[PDB]
Design a protein around this ligand. Structure first.
Ligand SMILES: [Zn+2]
Ligand SMILES: [Zn+2]
Ligand SMILES: [Zn+2]
Ligand SMILES: [Zn+2]
Ligand SMILES: [Zn+2]
Ligand SMILES: [Zn+2]
Lengths: 117, 117
């Protein structure tokens, strides 16, 4: 029937991050404050409806350059690590951009932390 | 600082499998008994050192067509879902091929079913 799905997905993700840090099989460039960072098209799409829509047919969606977004640097790291780097100064910014990106794990993570503070 | 959100792994692989279902951002074809199944190079590479190696330099990997390997029809589904159909009758074919593919998760599964004895 099945094996352990949370354990398996973890190993797969940890492997996709290792591929990234080595430029291995990366097929796009994710821009952050002007800076290029290699990434897997499939993974950005897996994380965000916005990126999904962008590779399928970009002409059809909102032309918003989020390259300079406050919190965006934290969002790319999360995608591949499932680790979020929040601080009292950056919670709102990360939340705002993840809400735009439609990334629910981060939305509820930030909401969770905000509720405690 | 850093907070772990491990459910996000399950989100990435679930969506990667959704992408495979709808024919999206797949860049390679996994062959079983001559049959073409669409997949992501990055997912296959993440799960198997054999596949990782095959997309890097196909010309200097052993010249063995494993399309007809007994148990290979078990592998692709597992990579995306962790779903696995082991049985007394098929454990060894799966193990044998899981070994060639360097897949520890599937090897461990096979050994566990074989322990019922
Ligand atoms: Zn696994
Ligand atoms: Zn640039
Ligand atoms: Zn269109
Ligand atoms: Zn600071
Ligand atoms: Zn997520
Ligand atoms: Zn063929």
């Amino acid at each position: 029937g099945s094996m352990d799905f949370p354990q398996h997905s973890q190993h797969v993700l940890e492997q996709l991050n290792q591929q990234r840090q080595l430029g291995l099989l990366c097929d796009c460039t994710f821009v952050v404050d002007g800076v290029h960072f290699k990434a897997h098209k499939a993974v950005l799409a897996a994380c965000s409806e916005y990126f999904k829509m962008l590779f399928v047919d970009q002409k059809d969606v909102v032309h918003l350059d989020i390259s300079n977004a406050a919190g965006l640097g934290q969002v790319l790291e999360f995608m591949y690590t499932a680790k979020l780097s929040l601080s009292p100064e950056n919670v709102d910014d990360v939340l705002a951009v993840a809400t735009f990106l439609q990334m629910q794990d981060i939305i509820t993570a930030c909401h969770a932390l905000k509720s405690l503070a």
